[PDB]
């Protein structure tokens, strides 16, 4: 649940 905030792109993957 990182890139739901648009500012989590790193972890995202």
Same mark, same amino acid.
């Given at each position: 649940? *990182? *890139?739901?905030?648009? @500012? &989590? @792109?790193? @972890? &995202? @993957?």
């Amino acid at each position: 649940g *990182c *890139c739901s905030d648009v @500012r &989590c @792109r790193y @972890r &995202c @993957r």
